[PDB]
Every structure is written in structure tokens, then in C-alpha cells.
Amino acid sequence: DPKYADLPGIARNEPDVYETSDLPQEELTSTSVEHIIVNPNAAYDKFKDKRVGTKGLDFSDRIGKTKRTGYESGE
Amino acid sequence: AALVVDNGSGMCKAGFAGDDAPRAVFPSIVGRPRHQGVMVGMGQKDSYVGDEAQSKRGILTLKYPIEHGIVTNWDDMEKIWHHTFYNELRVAPEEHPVLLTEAPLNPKANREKMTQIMFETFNTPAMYVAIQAVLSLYASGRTTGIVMDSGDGVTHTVPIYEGYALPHAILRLDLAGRDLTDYLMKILTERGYSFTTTAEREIVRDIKEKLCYVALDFEQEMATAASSSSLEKSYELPDGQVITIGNERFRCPEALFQPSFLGMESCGIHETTFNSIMKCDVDIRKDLYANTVLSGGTTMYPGIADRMQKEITALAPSTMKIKIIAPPERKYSVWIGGSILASLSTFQQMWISKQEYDESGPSIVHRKCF
Amino acid sequence: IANQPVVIDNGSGVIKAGFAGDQIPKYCFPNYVGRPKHVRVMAGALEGDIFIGPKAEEHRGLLSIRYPMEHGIVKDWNDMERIWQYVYSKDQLQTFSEEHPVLLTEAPLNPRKNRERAAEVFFETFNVPALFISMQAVLSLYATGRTTGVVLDSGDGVTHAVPIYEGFAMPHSIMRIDIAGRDVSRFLRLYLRKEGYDFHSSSEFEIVKAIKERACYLSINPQKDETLETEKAQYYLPDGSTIEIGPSRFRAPELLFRPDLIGEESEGIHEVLVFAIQKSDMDLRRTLFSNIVLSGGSTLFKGFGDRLLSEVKKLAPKDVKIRISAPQERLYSTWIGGSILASLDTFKKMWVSKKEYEEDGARSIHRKTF
Amino acid sequence: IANQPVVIDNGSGVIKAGFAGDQIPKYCFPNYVGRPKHVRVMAGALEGDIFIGPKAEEHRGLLSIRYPMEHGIVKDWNDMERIWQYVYSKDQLQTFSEEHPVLLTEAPLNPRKNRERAAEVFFETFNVPALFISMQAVLSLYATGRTTGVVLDSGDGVTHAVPIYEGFAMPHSIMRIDIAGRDVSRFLRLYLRKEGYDFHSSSEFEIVKAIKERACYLSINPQKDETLETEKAQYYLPDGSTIEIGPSRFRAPELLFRPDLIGEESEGIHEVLVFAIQKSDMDLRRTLFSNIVLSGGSTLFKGFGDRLLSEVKKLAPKDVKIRISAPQERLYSTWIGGSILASLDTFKKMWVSKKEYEEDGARSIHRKTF
């Protein structure tokens, strides 16, 4: 009796939850495009020590020479 | 020769080719009275319709048979139809091809069902249904023009160019003054007035049309109203009550510019129309400023033309010369355009006969109605 | 002053009050109007027969009781003056307006004039140092502890459904129809009118109220129960009126869910309810269908929750079951929420200082009303 | 070093981020901004109004979606600032921008101004030690290992094909057109509009998105399967609704090849791809058929590539050898290749020294980047 005789206007006997009952791609047939089985370390060893050098790494839309192709120095 | 019947969820009209005034003019709403349980004598009609229902509006409840194109019951709609025919013209449908209208966004099954029953029930020789906007610019006098429909429950921006147009360019929001009627009725309820039945709706739509003028900036207008309440005009109803409103009057159509009054996650009529213009050619958009054609029955309110003009004026550059075409008769003009359409023999060579549905079925409805 | 503030509550049928810390409102005082039945032959009597509780139980000769706030719609205020005045009098809480701040709620969908008049009393006549006005369902939520949930409740003459998630609710999504128990009492006596009994004044109305809340229940199959057979038990008044009732003892859902069968224009709690829920976010709607706060101080009958479940089953997207919530007593939850409200930091940022009222009043009332 | 390079996988639809060596997907999330939608005063609610995540993908009717990104180009950079702050969260980042290197993705051919504004934030507001941004195509190729490559892909708004071999960029050979999934949603909605199903809200938009990545498959025959008779089995919706299959689901991606039906002219994805092949050389063309690219998460469809291969049959001459996968995660693939890329030795030269950005900035990066 927290407030039974005290206050007769407070809720009880209420099942306000509203229940229910327990009642519970890879079309590779085509020949469209391949994939590669990821192995980050394999590709890491693939691109292992490419000493690419960026001498004059310029790719602007400048017009003053013949052509521009950076990422060119090697070992 | 023909059978011209303009339609509308409210205003439904009729007559024939060459006629300038629609013979049939009535509210196309379905009235359902208070059928109670105790006995009574001498009876009445099962459910009076529009004018029939308005005559005895005290019991008859004119609920909507359509909802922004969503026809509730085809049966009741036919009752409206049949009685209207045998109320106004009293002519059989086998006389001439019929003429009716519709608007987009409608599932093709509705227009198919429509025409299907039109041949079923009526067995007309031929028939035809079109788009209101076509008759609008058709009666206007252009093949290149952007208009917008503001009926009782519809809104749609139609840009045309030499007759050509694009469905992608034509935009649509089927929202209109009925929503405003709801908004206005509830805010006046907040003011302290009772509103339960459909007669409440009728009186408020009445005074709504009687007071929805268009001012410019509600901030200063509101400031002047609170300052001087002289704008708060009074009006005595059929009942002894006399209400006084000033803001309410013109601020009710401001929701057309702002969905914020209803919180609709939408855009203003002006910017919506602007985007419709944006779906075009840079040259023809200029023509839209030139062909700023206006329609819709809920555009019989003074001031908004200058408003929308100023809106797009702030939107479009100064070089875009605005040329608003504002016909104050656009409401009836669709029916009139239908009559003019019914006057061009070539169009009356193009038809939808019996055998088309009898054999072809309803696919010709998709490729022949428009 | 840092005393315990007065927490006045409200109610169309049962109005409450209290302090920030009371766990029980000391008086379960109903909302009514004590008056004389005839012109008192001798002057200098119990002026207006302002009677409360035992004073109302004192005599019955020249005593006509009414309501000063019909179904939440309050019209006059002199009765309210004396009622509040009696509360202010040192028989209720033995305190003053100035001695304690006052918390109070208000029913929605009301004109501002009500708020105007009340604040005029509370600051002009009586002097509240810090007041406040709020809602009711919010307080009920605080009592239940939920801050979310489809709130639903129904007072003595006011019914309302408010969809809520974290307190948020759209006014468009908020629905309310003010019709409950008082008219049920009117119809109980109307049932007995068909049965031929005593019908002269409010005394019988009191009797019928005692019946309604005492010698009345609600069944589930009115067609079956109407076609069934009972011997119709009776009651004993101070006269000992052994009167039989029958179906009329439980003919109330034809007022709750089907009041239109009394040739009336309404919908049904469940209908308007579900519609308001449908105004929300469909998926959030689905989630909140599992948590629908059900309440109501008048909805105190067995089986009616099952009838509501039947409405649910007819309206829920089937197999998404929603069982019965059966809260028996629903009164003080609002009073409890107000006690918890004023007991927290809330009123400190939510008061209405008398000074600010003196400065602006209605301006401050509505600038701080939300 | 503890300062692990922060990989950022920003795409149109799919958007992510990452780190070097940490192969596995860190944190997935969508590409928009979540604004609040309604008000209240009641306690028991979350505030901040910038809501992204579970509450965003939970309280859809309480938060609106904001896409400042238009085909990979954002207009309101402050939204990205908030997005990046959501990234900066120590529930998301747990670190500081100024303490770690940063790599980022970008679709090519975008205006430099975007990059400028981006780097302004990325260095001025956040003194990031190292930063480099590149093409997702490159990252994908690094993930593959083929020096060759014609990256054909689409996010949710951009079609693009990148022919390359050993990193050799022929900008005249590379092509793109801003179109993908956003219009797929729009066209889905268009069919809904054709059948009366208005789903315009931000919440409604995600519902359509669920339909998109839920109710879809294909057919190698356009009209041969289009002119037939469907079945349209209904499907249960997250509201409790159930709507038909519709042939439209597979009809929608054909708009990618027939955009004239939507109105704008284009050529055909595979056609522009062939044009790139034509811009290449005879010898390399054989390798082009040998070197095919599985890219774009939108491509997830049944018999997708089958139909595209048939188009190739209709275009390319004989002796065409094209083959297929067993794809793992076409999406993450790019980001993964970038993570491995971020885990490289000589990769240190690829960034931008912030000090140089202070000195010159953008233009120097533009010339240093491709």
C-alpha cells in the first residue's frame, strides 16, 4: 500500500507493452568482370620497393615545354 | 455534336461545343445525411448531392467523393453523374461523344476504370478525357506557356513550348485551398468558435474566399494590425455571431508561400514554379517569364500576382522581364477551352469509340486519351 | 521566497492542487458549482451555497449544482473565483498566494482569454510571486516515467491522444475531442428516461454519476449481450430505489466508439487515435505502436480495453500484435508529474514572475508559454 | 610511428575512411547531414541537432537528410565540417587531425575550387601534418594489381570509366557522366507516383533506398520482357505495408542506357566505354577486353553483366575475350587498396607538406597532383 487508500487514481494491472508471438548476389554465371582475392601483404610485396622519384612533379595545364610526366626517377 | 463536361472535385461544369457559359455548375461533393434509427414518414433521397445536399445542408454532410484525384467511390460518382445529366440536360449519353478531364499522378487503372464504366453504364458513341492545363493555355491563345493549377485539391506547373512539353518539366503538388480551409477552420476554432460538421467547412470556405486577400509582408502587416485593429473587419454569419479578423484573412493564403504553417517539408509555390522553369532551356525560360500564365480556381485572390512576380524577380535576373498573364476567369476557362476543343473537326475526327475497348481493351486508353 | 511552492492542478470533473513535495493532494475536490435551487426567502444565508465536500453533503434543499468549466470549456469565472478563493481560504492549505509560488496546467485548444482572466486573478486579486502553466499528459508521462510513447488519456469531459517521442509531438499530429463521462451520465439518465424514472435536476445527475462509476460496467459483445437475458440487478438510494438497468448499464461504447449512432457527428477514440499515429513517421509509428501510453480517468471499465483491442485488430497492420494495456486508476498521475516537475530545476527556468506579468502580461504569457 | 596515416574513403553514396595496414573496415556510415524536425520542452530527450548514426537511422521522422554533396561536390562546406567533426569524434577518430597523416579519395574532373576550399579546412582549421587526395580508380587498381585498367563504376550519382595502362593517363580517353543511384531512387519514386505512392520525406527517401537495394534484379531483354504480363507479388514493408513486385524495378536501370526517357541525352555506359576503347590502340584494345573492371557497388544486380556483355556483342567485333569474378567487397576494395597504398615506403613523397601549403598552396598541389 504505497498510496492505495491514499490516492485511488494511479495505474496498475497494465500490460502496456504490446506483445506478439514467436513466429519467425553471386550470379557468377556471367562472364562480365573479374575480382582479385585480397591479400594486402601479397600486393604489398608486389608494390614492394618501387623507388619512384618525383623530379619536377608538375601536371599543371601550363604551356611552355613539350610534355610533363612526373613520378619518374627510379633506383 | 459533342457533350462537354468539365470536371472538378468541387466545381464540375457542363454544356456543349460553342457554348460560352457552362450549363451545369454545382459543387461535386457527396452529401450524406444523418440516417438515424427511429422511425419517420414520407422519406427522402438516400443521399442528396451538392446542390441537392446544400438545399438541406442541416442534415446532409457533403463529404468529399474525391481526394486530390483519389475518387472514393465510383458508384457515388456515377450517381452524381447520372443525376447531373438527368438534372441539367436530361439527355442520353448515346447522343454524342463525351468530354471529361483529369490530371496526372493518377494510376492508369483509375482512368481505365473510369472510361471502362463510361462505356459500360453509358454506351456513348465515342468519348474523350484530357488535361485542364491544355484547355487553359488553349483558351489563352498560346502553344508556349507555363501555367499552374490551383483547384480545390490540386496544384501543377505546366510549361509548354509550341505545344511541346516534358513530363519531367511539368511539376506537380496536389495541394490546394481545401487544406487552407482546414487550417483556417482550426485557427478560428482556437479563436473560440465551434466547428464540427461540413456546414462549418462551407461557411468558412465562403468567408475564406470573401477575405483571403494578399498583402506583402506579414511582419509589418501584423505590426500595423496589432497597432491599429481597424483592419480586423467584422462579419455577421447567418447566425447572429459576428467575427472580427484582420490578419487571418490574408495570412491564411501565406501557407501557399510557406509550408511552415503546416510543416510539409516542401517548397514555396514560387520557388517550386521556379524549379519547373529550371528544368528547361535558357532561352525558353525567358519565354516563361514572358508567358507567366496563371490558372486555378484558388487564384481568385488579389495581390499574389505581384507577390509571385516579386518572388521570381528576386530570383531571376533583372534582364528576365516578367509578364504575368492573369485571367480572372481561369476557373471556367477550362470548360470553355473544352468547347473550343470540341469545335475543331480534326480533334473530333480523333476518337475513342466502342470497338476500341470492345476489342483493344484499355491499352488504347493509355495511348489515346493523351 | 524559498518556501514550498503551491502546485495547483486542474480538472473538468475533478480538480486537484498541492505543493512541491506533497505525495498526496489533500482534497479530491470535484469541479462543480454549488447554488440555491430557489430564491432563499430569508436574506443573509450561505451566500451562493458555496459548499465543498461535507458542506455539499450538508443539505440538499436549495442546492443546484452545476459545472463552471463544461467539458473543459470554461465560460464564466465567478464560480472559479469562489472555488479558488475557498482553496486560498485557510481550510485547504492554510497558505497565501504570496507565500508560495504556483504551478498550474491548462487544457489545450483554448482561447487566450482564459489564460488572460486566470492570470488577472492570480496576480491582481491574489498575488502569485512565480506561476506557471503547462500540459497534463506530459505530467502523466513523468509519473509513468516514460518520455516517449503514444500518449492517450481521457478526462471527465475531455479526451485526447498525443503521439510522443522524447516529449516531441507535432501539433498536427496531436488530436483531441472533448467529450467524456458527463454526457455518459446524460445518456444514462436518458436510458432511464426511456425506462420512465425521476427526471428533475442535478440531484439525479449526481445519482447517475454514482451509478456510472459504481453500478455500471462495460461488456464486449453488445449485439449478443443485447440479445441475451439478465434479471437486471438494482440499487438503493436514500429512498431505496430498487431500479433495474440491463443493457443500458453498459450501453456506453455506443458513445465511446459509436456515438454517431446517437445521430451524432464524431469518429471514435481509436479512429482519431490511429489517424494521429498515422500522421507520424510510418516506421517510427510502428515502433511506437509497441509503446502506446494509455490512460484516462473516465475510461474505468473492464472489457473496454478488449474492445479497443478489437479496434486495433481491425486497424493494425495485422500479425503485428498489440495486446491490452490495462491501467486501472488514472487520476493523480498528472498531479504526481506536477509535484515532480516543481520539485526539480524546471520551475526555476519555467516560472512566471509577477513583475514580468506586470510589465507585459499576455505578451509574457505567450512568449513564455512555449 | 603512432601517427598512422588516416585514409579517408569519401565517395558519392558510399563513404568511409581508414588507416594503413588496418585492412578491415573501420566505420561505415552514410553521406548526409541529420537536422532535427520537431520541438517540445519536456525532459528526457537528446539535443545537439547534428545527429548522425543510430539515432539518425532510428529517428527518421525526427531528423531531415541534407545532401550538400552533389555528384561528389559539396556546396555547403560547413556541413562537411560537421561531418568531419563527427569523424573527429573520439567514438569515431579517437585522435587529432594535426597528429596524423591523411590520405583521401576523390572522383576526378572535379573543379579545383572544391579542392581549394577542402584544403583550406584541412590545413587552416586543422593543421594536418600530411595530406594527399587522389582518384578512387587508382586505389582500386592498386587493390587489383593490374597495371592495366578501365575503371567503370558508379556511386549513387556518377557514372565513370577510366582507361589506363601502367598508370599512363590519357585524359582524352577517360570519361564520366554524373548519374547513378540517386536518380534510381527518384525513378523508383516516379513509378510510385505512377501508382500513387508519395514518398517525398527524408525518412520516405530512405524507405525508397531500402526498396532500391532490396527490391531489385534484372532482365537481359528490355521490351521482350517489358510488353508481357507481370505477377507483381506483394512485399512486406517496414511500416506493415505490403506492395507489389513491379516490372519497373528492373526497368529503372535501363534508364542508364535510355536517359532520353528521363529526358537528358547521353550515350550508354558501355557505349562511352567502347568510345574509350576506340580512342585507344588496336593492340591495347585486345587487352581492354582482357582487362575488364568490376567496380561500382550500384552494379549489384542479377544478370547485370550478362546484359552488358550482350551489348558488347552488339558492338565489338569478334575475338573478344571477357571473363568473371567471385567478388568479395567491390565497395571496400578501393579503400583497401588505398590503405595498402598508405602503408608504402616511397608514399611519403606523395603528400603535401603543410608548410608549402602555407606558402603557396592549392595551385602547387594541382600541378603536383595529376
Ligand SMILES: Nc1ncnc2c1ncn2[C@@H]1O[C@H](COP(=O)(O)OP(=O)(O)OP(=O)(O)O)[C@@H](O)[C@H]1O
Ligand atoms: N470565386 C472564387 N474566389 C476565390 N476562390 C475560389 C473561387 N472559386 C473557387 N475558389 C477556390 O477554388 C477551390 C474550389 O474549386 P475550384 O473552383 O478551383 O474548381 P475545382 O473543383 O477545384 O476544379 P478541379 O477540382 O478540377 O481543380 C476552393 O479552394 C476555393 O477556395
Ligand SMILES: Nc1ncnc2c1ncn2[C@@H]1O[C@H](COP(=O)(O)OP(=O)(O)O)[C@@H](O)[C@H]1O
Ligand atoms: N468508475 C468510473 N467510470 C466512469 N467514469 C469515471 C469513473 N470514475 C471517475 N470517472 C470520471 O472520470 C473523471 C476523472 O477523469 P480525470 O482525468 O480526473 O478528469 P477530471 O480531472 O476532469 O475529472 C472523473 O471526473 C469522473 O467523473
Ligand SMILES: Nc1ncnc2c1ncn2[C@@H]1O[C@H](COP(=O)(O)OP(=O)(O)O)[C@@H](O)[C@H]1O
Ligand atoms: N544492391 C545494390 N543495388 C543498387 N545499388 C547499390 C547496391 N549496393 C550498393 N549500391 C549503391 O552503390 C554505390 C556504391 O558505389 P561506390 O563504388 O561505393 O561509390 P561511392 O563510394 O561513391 O558510393 C552506393 O552509392 C550504393 O548506394
